[PDB]
Design an enzyme around this catalytic site. Sequence first.
Site, PDB file in Angstrom:
ATOM      1  N   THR A 210      -2.819  39.902 -34.235  1.00  0.00           N
ATOM      2  CA  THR A 210      -4.113  40.487 -34.547  1.00  0.00           C
ATOM      3  C   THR A 210      -4.151  41.971 -34.205  1.00  0.00           C
ATOM      4  O   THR A 210      -3.335  42.458 -33.421  1.00  0.00           O
ATOM      5  CB  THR A 210      -5.225  39.783 -33.747  1.00  0.00           C
TER       6      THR A 210
ATOM      7  N   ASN B 246      -7.291  43.243 -33.486  1.00  0.00           N
ATOM      8  CA  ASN B 246      -8.605  43.312 -32.855  1.00  0.00           C
ATOM      9  C   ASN B 246      -8.497  43.113 -31.340  1.00  0.00           C
ATOM     10  O   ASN B 246      -8.371  41.990 -30.859  1.00  0.00           O
ATOM     11  CB  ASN B 246      -9.520  42.250 -33.480  1.00  0.00           C
ATOM     12  N   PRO B 247      -8.554  44.214 -30.568  1.00  0.00           N
ATOM     13  CA  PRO B 247      -8.461  44.168 -29.105  1.00  0.00           C
ATOM     14  C   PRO B 247      -9.538  43.304 -28.453  1.00  0.00           C
ATOM     15  O   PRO B 247      -9.283  42.630 -27.454  1.00  0.00           O
ATOM     16  CB  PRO B 247      -8.567  45.640 -28.709  1.00  0.00           C
TER      17      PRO B 247
ATOM     18  N   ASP C 166      -9.746  34.019 -37.702  1.00  0.00           N
ATOM     19  CA  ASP C 166     -10.661  34.721 -38.584  1.00  0.00           C
ATOM     20  C   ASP C 166     -12.044  34.207 -38.219  1.00  0.00           C
ATOM     21  O   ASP C 166     -12.208  33.058 -37.812  1.00  0.00           O
ATOM     22  CB  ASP C 166     -10.359  34.500 -40.069  1.00  0.00           C
TER      23      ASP C 166
ATOM     24  N   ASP D 154     -22.297  41.356 -32.504  1.00  0.00           N
ATOM     25  CA  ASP D 154     -22.770  40.844 -31.223  1.00  0.00           C
ATOM     26  C   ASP D 154     -24.119  41.412 -30.766  1.00  0.00           C
ATOM     27  O   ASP D 154     -24.935  40.674 -30.216  1.00  0.00           O
ATOM     28  CB  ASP D 154     -21.734  41.080 -30.118  1.00  0.00           C
TER      29      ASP D 154
END
EC number: 3.6.1.66
Lengths: 186, 186
Positions: B7, B9-10, B65, B143
Site C-alpha cells: 500500500t 497509504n501511511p 480497499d 474521517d
Amino acid sequence: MKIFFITSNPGKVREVANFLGTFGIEIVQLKHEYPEIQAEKLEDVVDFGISWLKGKVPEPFMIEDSGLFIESLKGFPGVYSSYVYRTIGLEGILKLMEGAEDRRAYFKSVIGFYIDGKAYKFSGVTWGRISNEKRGTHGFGYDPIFIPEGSEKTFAEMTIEEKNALSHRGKALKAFFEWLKVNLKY
Amino acid sequence: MKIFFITSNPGKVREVANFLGTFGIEIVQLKHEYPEIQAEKLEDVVDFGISWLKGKVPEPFMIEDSGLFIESLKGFPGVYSSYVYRTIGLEGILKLMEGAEDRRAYFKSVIGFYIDGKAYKFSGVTWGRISNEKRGTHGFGYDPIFIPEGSEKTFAEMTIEEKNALSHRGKALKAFFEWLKVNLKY
C-alpha cells in the site's frame, strides 16, 4: 504583528520565529516560568499553563509543549520527553530499543495561544522512526535519532527551515498561522 | 509472524499495524504499485489487485480497499472515495448533503490476503452518519465528517486504537486475525 512566546527553550523560539517571521509576525521570547503539570496529554499541560499565565504577561501570548511518543514503549517518553532526554538521553532510548521489531514513533506539538481573554490550541503530529544511531548537528532533544516518514535524514541533519517543513511543530505553526490570518487579519 | 502490506497509504498501515501488532504480527509496508480497477464492489478491486501482484512481492501479503457509501447519494463516493476526497473533499460532500433528510452512510473495508498460492478476503462494515461540520485531527480521508453509530465523535476525533475498536477496517482486521489464528497457528 507581535506575539510573545513564553518559553525557556531557545531552540523552540528559533523554529517558531523562523516559520512565522516569513509572514510578518514578530516573535518575542519572554522568560516567565509557569507550572507544567504532569498529565497524559500535551494539551492538558498547555491548558493549565495558559490559565496560570493569563493576566501576568503581555498579550497576545503563546506557549508550546511537545514530546516524542514511541510505539513499542507505549508512548514513552511523551509528555516527559524533556526530563527523559536530560537523564537517560539518546543513549537511553537507543538502549531501550535494542532488538525492537517496531521502531515507529511520532512527535507531537501543541501550541497554546491567548488573546482578548480567550485561549486557543493548535497541534501537529509527524510520524517516523527511531534510528539505530544518532546523527546530525542541528536541532535539540531527540532530533538526532528521529527520522520522519519520507526522509532519509534525522531531524538533526536538517536546517530549521527544512525541519519546519516536515515537523510536528511546523504543522502546529501552519494551523496557528491560518487561524491568525483568518481571525486577526493582521 | 510477518505480513507484507502492499500500500501507499501511511494512515492505513498505522491502523493495520496497531491492531495486529498487539497479537505478535509484524506488518511490513511494501510500496509496490498495482492497478485498482474501476468496479462496483471493493471486493472486485481487491481480487484484481491480488491476481496482479502474486509472484511479484514477498509472501504472505495483504492489500486493502475501502470507501464511504452515502445512502442519499446512492452509495457515492464508494469505490472512488479516494479520488472524490482529493477533488471535492470534505467541503464537496457537505455541499451535496445540504438539506439532506437522511445523512446515513457506511464505511466498508475489504482486506485481501495471499499465502501458499491462494487468495482470501475479509470485510468489515460500520454504519453511521455524515456530520454537518468537520471535526478532528486524527485519521485521514472522510474521517472528519463521519460519526459511527453509537458515538458522539467523528472518526477523526478518535485515536487509532479507539477508531479500530469501532471501524470498518477494525472489523475486517478482526475477521482476518481470527482466520490467521485458526489456519496458521503462528
